[PDB]
Each structure stands twice: as C-alpha cells, then as structure tokens.
Copies of this chain bind each other. A is one copy, B any other.
C-alpha cells in the first residue's frame, strides 16, 4: 500500500532527521556565544521537542544554521504526521466502504 509505504518511509526519515538534526545543531551552535544547544544528548531532546512542536523553550537555536536545522526538523515532523494521518484516513475509508459492501 502506497499510504503505508509513505507513512513508513517518513517515520524512518524522521528518526534520521532527529539524529542528524542533533548532530548538526551542536555543530552549528558551538561557536555562538550564549548558545545552549551545544551537547548531543540535550540537542536530541531539542530535536524531539521541535518535531512535535511541544514548545517548552528550554532550548532553541540562536544561529542561522541552527535555525535552518530547526526548520528541517519541524517540516520532517509535520510532514510525517500529515502522512500518518492521511494513511489512517485511507485505511479507515477503504475499510468503512468494505463494511458497506461497496
């Protein structure tokens, strides 16, 4: 099924973006005074925070490339949620229409 293929891919791409995201954030932010997004464990928590949009504001990037990273993480999280939701809708719709004989 295309929808599960798409939902599966995005969820693997998301994990990859969260990991590379953590790595790249630290690389982009070290060098910038006042930057807090500068060790891998907290940076990875930051990435999860960001992908989900949970907005604690305990950590955020202060640099251009940190912020670019942030956006790729947001979009990957947002994209994968839309593809999961759309896959869940496709599943339910095709199952409801077989539950009607249609």
Report which A residues bind B (CB closer than 8 A).
1-3, 6, 45, 48, 50, 52-58, 60, 67, 70-71, 74-75, 78, 81-97, 99-100
Complex Cα distance, B53 from A75, in Å, reads 11
* Overall SS of chain A's interface: helix
With a CB–CB cut-off of 8 A, which chain B residues contact A86? 85-86, 88-89, 91-92
Q: Is the CB of B94 within 8 A of A89?
A: no
Q: Is the CB of B52 within 8 A of A74?
A: yes
Given contacts A54-B55, A82-B81, A85-B86, contact A93 B95 (CB under 8 A): no
Which listed residue, B67, B81, B90, B95, touches A92 by the CB 8 Å rule? B90
With a CB–CB cut-off of 8 A, which chain B residues contact A1? 96, 99
